[PDB]
């Protein structure tokens, strides 16, 4: 019945499309199981949730700048003039059952999408996963991050509330028009005239629901296809070489783990959507150029840019009756940052001279200069991000606002230098900590007094020993070293049973023996594969 | 490469191993999770997985039941239903998020406790492809190009390059041309002819001697959103936002008046801060050149638009006389012609000249003498 049906459908599919060999190649593909290789798929799942909830939102949203009088249920805004966009954003959150939940899941998913992209980028950079043959795919990811930043910005600009409209007036309108020679032409091409105009929100809506997400989808497809057919990197370890992939096959283990991780990410984003308020636009009011509120932060992934605006000094030039205003610096700065991010693999292969194929990753401690540089970059990013929140920090943490500006200004130079130096020394220090275990074995923490009164700590050797009993020094192999005896199995196991009642002793004995035999067989399999290759 | 009768005599395990070998994959370790049968620990673990999946099912049913029957509609402030309404979206998120969260946990546990533990090794076969494939694909492409004879027909090659270039150029220009707009096209009627938008605002006179009142927002939409203002309406230490209003703009009862007042409210270079200096502080006022008579006694009027990037710079500290912009923390000295003293702003806020008319209402005494708002390449 259920088996004959599967065989019949399988034969029908195979006689018509003969996919057996290609499907089997997909089922046998091996992926490494490292926890940090799951960071990219948080971004993928966030993007999928964004697509689903965004499609739901487009069924109710009218992105018009046409001014109307609010006639809905939210009493504190009755009679207030607003755009159709603000109108329908309110209608979603009050007049459609589940609309507020969908809207909040969309916005939380956008935040998790940007944050996931950042953390996954950090893994790629610090482990060296960008090196050849994978330079292009770092470039594709860099473009994906830029597109995600601007997509999220356009998305939260759509409701045309006071806060987001203030963000549009300063960043999208002010910086753009400040651009030299072509600034005002770019402004009038984008807005159709002066700010705010009547075309901006419908145009941003078209960019946000179709055009930018289509480019993102195409780039994500290229990205995942490159990963799939270039065969994911791995960390050094037992049995791992430059020419193999150690891990699990797709069918069934990796497929089950991916599906379960997708379900758990969805659960977290769903709990956030209905437990934490995000962007309650009815409290902000519709956008009016005469109004503003304290605390005009953008979403976090834009804050650094805003932070840069806050920190850069009022340096302007007035050549021959023209004006180059302060915001131009910020624009140039952004370009520079992006250009340095896209170009990093080629910069590093030019500096280091290393142009070899690489499939084995580097532990971040073992590349101290790149780790120091990335730590320096993260320090600058965090300083600019917190500079953007300097007014909130001043209010909550009792710091002068002027002082926060100057702390950001000086720290923008000093903090990355300090962080670079500290991260460099810390990475080399971890290298020395690994060396110590390699020469002496694992410190067990057990102190012993010898008969003549010496105090010695017992060590657990990781390899062969002498006739004197000291271990032979082992060579570093790019892989982590154990430093706790409990992580080597010294603690044993409690004893089989439920939490409150023991199982029969014979069951416990059989289970423990089977577990030890299985662990030994797995170690032996990896060892003999390593010995053979 | 076995045969059809050798395949029929293979067990599943040998077939799995052969399929892996064809694909370049060897499973070097593979063991069932429970080699000893009939153990209480196995039944306990089975029940643990089932418990997580059952929690997922119950919470999914709870999502169904709360979405149908929880009171979801907005309730106003201080009403009896406001508290239950405030839990609707939280309950949606709790029942949805828990459900799929519990199913994911249960599936993770099933993989970790019941699906066999596995180590598999795949050969990469990466780098340059075998020489046969490189040579044959290169021969294919080179034969296509050289066989076509396109390289030795230079009139055709040049014509194709020029024609494709011209078509692409024309198509690109026609595709983006509709977006391009001259920002300096004169479109705004003023007392001395049409002017470009950025040089003007609601304070630009439309004819010589036009009376433009400093109007204040009543906050009631329609029904006179803007009214005239008198100098005694503001105390020393007070600040009010005023807008450029004309008698002909009306009270917003008609449709045309309403559209005019909407254009007043939405004009980005319109809002003005009117401050009244304390008379004891008038000796500390420094005037800007060309603006020495722009104040009506102790009343000063500056643009509310920040000169840095256009935010409403409206945090007016009456004792320090400091105008703070909330966006990027620029600070302007109201006593020294709104000159910037902190932040990214390099330019002072424009001063509006003000006076009173015969009825004693505050009116503008002309236009700004410089462009208002953020700077641009073309300015000054």
């Amino acid at each position: 019945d259920f088996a004959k049906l599967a065989a019949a459908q399988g034969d029908a599919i195979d006689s018509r499309y003969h996919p057996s060999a290609a499907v089997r190649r997909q089922l046998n593909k091996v992926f490494p199981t490292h926890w940090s290789f799951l960071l990219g798929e948080i971004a993928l799942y966030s993007f999928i949730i964004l697509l689903l909830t965004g499609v739901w939102l487009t069924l109710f949203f009218d992105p018009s700048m046409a001014h109307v009088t609010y006639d809905g249920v939210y009493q504190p805004l009755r009679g207030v003039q607003m755009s159709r966009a603000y109108e329908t954003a309110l209608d979603i959150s009050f007049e459609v059952r589940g609309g507020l939940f969908v809207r909040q899941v969309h916005h939380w998913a956008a935040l998790m999408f940007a944050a996931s992209i950042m953390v996954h980028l950090a893994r790629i950079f610090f482990t060296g996963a960008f090196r050849r043959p994978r330079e292009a795919n770092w470039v594709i990811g860099s473009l994906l991050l830029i597109l995600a930043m601007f997509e999220g910005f356009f998305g939260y600009s759509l409701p045309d509330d006071l806060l987001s409209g203030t963000g549009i007036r300063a960043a999208l309108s002010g910086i753009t028009m400040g651009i030299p020679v072509i600034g005002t032409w770019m402004h009038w091409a984008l807005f159709g005239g002066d700010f705010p105009g009547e075309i901006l929100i419908p145009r941003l809506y078209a960019l946000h629901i179709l055009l930018i997400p289509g480019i993102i989808l195409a780039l994500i497809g290229a990205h995942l296809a490159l990963v799939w057919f270039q065969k994911h990197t791995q960390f050094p370890g037992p049995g791992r070489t430059e020419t193999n992939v150690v891990g699990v096959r797709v069918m069934p283990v990796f497929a089950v783990k991916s599906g379960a991780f997708f379900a758990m990410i969805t659960g977290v984003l769903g709990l956030m959507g209905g437990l934490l308020t995000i962007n309650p636009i009815w409290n902000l009011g519709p956008y009016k150029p005469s109004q503003v509120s304290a605390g005009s932060q953008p979403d976090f992934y834009m804050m650094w840019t805003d932070g840069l605006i806050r920190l850069w000094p009022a340096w302007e030039f007035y050549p021959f009756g023209h004006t180059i205003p302060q915001g131009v610096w910020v624009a140039v700065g952004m370009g520079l940052v992006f250009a340095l991010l896209i170009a990093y693999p080629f910069i590093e292969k030019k500096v280091t001279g290393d142009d070899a194929h690489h499939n084995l990753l580097q532990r971040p401690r073992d590349v101290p200069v790149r780790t120091a540089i990335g730590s320096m970059a993260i320090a600058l990013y965090l300083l600019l991000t917190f500079a953007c929140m300097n007014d909130i920090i001043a209010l909550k943490f009792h710091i002068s606002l002027n002082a926060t500006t100057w702390i950001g200004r000086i720290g923008m130079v000093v903090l990355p230098a300090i962080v670079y130096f500290v991260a460099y020394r810390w990475a080399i220090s971890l290298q020395r900590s690994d060396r110590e275990v390699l020469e002496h074995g694992v410190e067990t923490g057990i102190i012993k007094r010898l008969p003549h009164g010496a105090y010695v700590e017992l060590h657990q050797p990781l390899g062969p020993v002498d006739e004197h009993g000291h271990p032979i020094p082992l060579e570093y192999a790019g892989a982590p070293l154990p430093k706790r005896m409990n992580k080597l199995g010294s603690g044993g196991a409690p004893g089989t049973g439920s939490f409150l009642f023991p199982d029969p002793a014979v069951e416990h004995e059989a289970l423990t023996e089977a577990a030890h035999a299985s662990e030994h067989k797995s170690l032996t399999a990896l060892k003999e594969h390593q010995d053979r290759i | 490469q076995p045969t059809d009768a050798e395949l029929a005599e293979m067990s599943r395990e040998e077939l799995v191993k052969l399929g892996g070998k064809i694909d370049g994959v060897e499973t070097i370790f593979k063991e069932p999770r429970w080699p000893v049968p009939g153990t209480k620990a196995e039944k306990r673990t089975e029940r643990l997985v089932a418990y997580w999946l059952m929690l997922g099912g119950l919470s999914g049913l709870a999502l169904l039941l709360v979405f149908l029957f929880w009171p979801w509609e907005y309730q106003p402030f201080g009403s009896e239903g406001e508290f239950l309404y405030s839990l609707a979206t939280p309950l949606y998120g709790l029942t949805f998020g828990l459900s799929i969260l519990s199913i994911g946990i249960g599936a993770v546990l099933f993989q970790k406790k019941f699906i066999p533990e596995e180590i598999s090794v795949q050969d990469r076969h990466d780098g340059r492809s075998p020489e046969v494939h490189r040579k044959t694909v290169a021969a294919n492409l080179t034969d296509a190009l050289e066989g076509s004879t396109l390289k030795r027909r230079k009139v055709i090659g040049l014509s194709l390059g020029i024609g494709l270039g011209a078509f692409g150029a024309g198509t690109l220009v026609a595709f983006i041309g509709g977006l391009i707009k001259n920002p300096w096209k004169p479109v705004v009627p003023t007392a001395e002819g049409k002017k470009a938008v950025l040089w003007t605002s609601g304070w630009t006179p439309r004819f010589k001697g036009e009376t433009i009142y400093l109007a204040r927002a009543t906050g009631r939409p329609g029904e006179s959103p803007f009214v005239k203002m008198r100098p005694e309406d503001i105390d020393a230490g007070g600040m009010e936002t005023v807008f450029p209003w004309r008698e002909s703009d009306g009270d917003g009862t008609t449709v045309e008046s309403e559209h005019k007042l909407t254009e007043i409210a939405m004009g980005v270079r319109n809002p003005v801060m009117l401050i009244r200096i304390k008379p004891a502080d008038m000796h500390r006022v420094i005037k800007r050149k060309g603006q020495e008579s722009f104040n009506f006694g102790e009343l000063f009027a500056y643009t509310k638009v920040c000169s840095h990037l256009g935010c409403p710079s409206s945090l007016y500290e009456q004792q320090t006389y400091r105008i703070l912009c909330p966006c990027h923390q620029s600070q302007f000295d109201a006593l020294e012609f709104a000159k910037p003293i902190f932040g990214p702003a390099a330019r002072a806020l424009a001063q509006l000249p003000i006076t009173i008319d015969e009825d004693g209402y505050l009116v503008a005494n002309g236009d700004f003498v410089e462009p208002v708002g953020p700077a641009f390449w073309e300015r000054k």
Binding site: - | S248, K287, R288, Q291, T355, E370
Partner: peptide, 25 residues
């Protein structure tokens, strides 16, 4: 650089004249 069209003055200034206002919108 400093904006060339922004300088302090020492001239005191006069009280503005009452606004009269021309006709013909």
């Amino acid at each position: 650089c400093s904006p060339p069209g922004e300088t302090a003055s020492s001239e005191p200034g006069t009280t503005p004249a009452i606004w009269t206002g021309s006709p013909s919108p």
